Design a protein around this ligand. Structure first.
Ligand SMILES: Nc1ncnc2c1ncn2[C@@H]1O[C@H](COP(=O)(O)OP(=O)(O)NP(=O)(O)O)[C@@H](O)[C@H]1O
Lengths: 383, 92
């Protein structure tokens, strides 16, 4: 039956479905409504999502992630070469096309970036199928608004390889605005700002809406700013503490630093609705248990510059859109990092107490809107 | 407006009758459109024929291809009426 919406995200992917009058964002078999965009290869299995992310410390070189950054690109792309340094997995050159070289079942193996993203997509497809009790084929898949034709065609190609029929490739901040039904309003054109802070990337887009038609007036942000960085500011806080307490540097240790990163991501989330969180690692380094605390105030302090700095791309987007801030009619909160209470405050203050569209889990909003659009592109939504 | 009146008159007269809508869609298409040959009733007798032509109609007017285009709003209108026409045809 139904077509689904899939947010194919740099760090997380999320699938939703329009069905029986509502959009459902669908939990995976571990209970999670977003799913890491991770693929891991061991001696015995190809791991996708959580099981892949959860083992990255024991198997760093074969746990692929960040394929969205390689998709639609030449190997000789400045961006590919820059980013490669940051990855623990190997990226090789197959005639001017990036591949990722890994060890899978004893053999060396390489995959194109659309093939990796196809694995994530397959995973998402099964998540929807497990929920719906039938096979899924038709999907709308989303991409960043700044994606070019080559990146958009590679994302569609990823769907095909996942056994999916891609009804449309649509823009992420447009989806989020569809989630809010921002197009279903009578009257003069509307300026909408999408503030989107995910796990690896920060996107501000301004959009006009009149007669249900969308145009992107401007975009800004930082392809290397998101929740991962706030995690890092936390890791080093604790590397330092650990050192003072135990006279050991866990900084040489890649498994130790990776294990603390998870601890850290987990506490940061707790900090979005509680004012302190507990860190609890058994045998973090050479047999030493690491138990400790952090407050929200402290978390915010360690990130105060990166939080506040998300207002520059906003200003920049407005001046490219040739708009003053008061000419924005709707502001939309997207990406899981927009859950951080301090981010909420700084954006609202910037807009002089104007109210923010956030009633929809920000890390789910893109998949939501894609689901709405997938129903429409089928005929599962009339009148 | 003149382009939208066209389509709304078209829908009204043809009564969600898929064959009638297909065999006259060429009268409401945007000037510029070349991918559509007018189709007579001769080519819309059997449900195979309706199906085959319908799946050709929706491609032309698909809201995804029409995204950004000056005719976007009309592609949408025709799409939606055809989808409804076809589902009425499926239920028959
Ligand atoms: N409660 C929370 N508090 C703080 N951060 C959170 C919370 N929940 C999720 N996040 C962060 O949100 C980030 C992932 O957001 P998400 O929007 O799922 O990313 P993405 O889909 O990879 N981006 P894109 O599709 O390019 O919009 C991670 O850094 C998470 O740690």
């Amino acid at each position: 039956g139904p077509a689904v919406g899939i947010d194919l995200g740099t760090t997380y992917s999320c699938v939703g479905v329009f069905q029986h009058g509502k959009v459902e964002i669908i939990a995976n078999d571990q209970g999670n409504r977003t799913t890491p965009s991770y693929v891991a290869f061991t001696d015995t299995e190809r791991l996708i999502g959580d099981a892949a992310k959860n083992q990255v410390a024991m198997n760093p070189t074969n746990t692929v992630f960040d394929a969205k950054r390689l998709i639609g690109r030449r190997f000789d792309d400045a961006v590919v070469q820059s980013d490669m340094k940051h990855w623990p997995f190997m990226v090789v050159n197959d005639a001017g096309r990036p591949k990722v070289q890994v060890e899978y079942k004893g053999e060396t193996k390489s995959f194109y970036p659309e093939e990796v993203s196809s694995m994530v997509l397959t995973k998402m497809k099964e998540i929807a199928e497990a929920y719906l009790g039938k096979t899924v084929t038709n999907a709308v898949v989303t991409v960043p608004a700044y994606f070019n034709d080559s990146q958009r065609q590679a994302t569609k190609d990823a769907g095909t390889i996942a056994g999916l029929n891609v009804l449309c490739i649509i823009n992420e901040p447009t989806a989020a605005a569809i989630a809010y039904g921002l197009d279903k309003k009578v009257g003069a054109e509307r300026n909408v700002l999408i503030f989107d802070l995910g796990g690896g990337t920060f996107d501000v887009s301004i959009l006009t809406i009149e007669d249900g038609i969308f145009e992107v007036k401007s975009t800004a942000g930082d392809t290397h700013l998101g929740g991962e960085d706030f995690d890092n500011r936390m890791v080093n806080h604790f590397i330092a503490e650990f050192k003072r307490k135990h006279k050991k540097d866990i900084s040489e240790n890649k498994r130790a630093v990776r294990r603390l990163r998870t601890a850290c991501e987990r506490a940061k989330r707790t900090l979005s609705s509680s004012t302190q969180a507990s860190i609890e690692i058994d045998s973090l380094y050479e047999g030493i248990d690491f138990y400790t605390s952090i407050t929200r105030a402290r978390f915010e302090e360690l990130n105060a510059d990166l939080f506040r700095g998300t207002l520059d791309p906003v200003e920049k987007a407005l001046r490219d859109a040739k708009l003053d801030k008061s000419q924005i009619h709707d502001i939309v909160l997207v990406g899981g990092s927009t859950r951080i209470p301090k981010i909420q405050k700084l954006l609202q203050d910037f807009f002089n107490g104007k109210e923010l569209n956030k009633s929809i889990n920000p890390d789910e909003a893109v998949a939501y809107g894609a689901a709405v659009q997938a129903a429409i592109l089928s005929g599962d939504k009339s009148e | 407006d003149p382009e939208k009146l066209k389509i709304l008159e078209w829908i009204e007269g043809k009564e969600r009758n898929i064959r009638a809508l297909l065999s006259t869609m060429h009268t409401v298409l945007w000037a510029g459109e070349t991918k559509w040959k007018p189709v007579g009733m001769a080519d819309l007798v059997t449900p195979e024929q309706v199906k085959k032509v319908y799946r050709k109609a929706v491609l032309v007017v698909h809201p995804c291809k029409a995204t950004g285009q000056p005719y976007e709003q009309y592609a949408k209108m025709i799409f939606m009426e055809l989808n409804d026409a076809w589902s009425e045809f499926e239920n028959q």
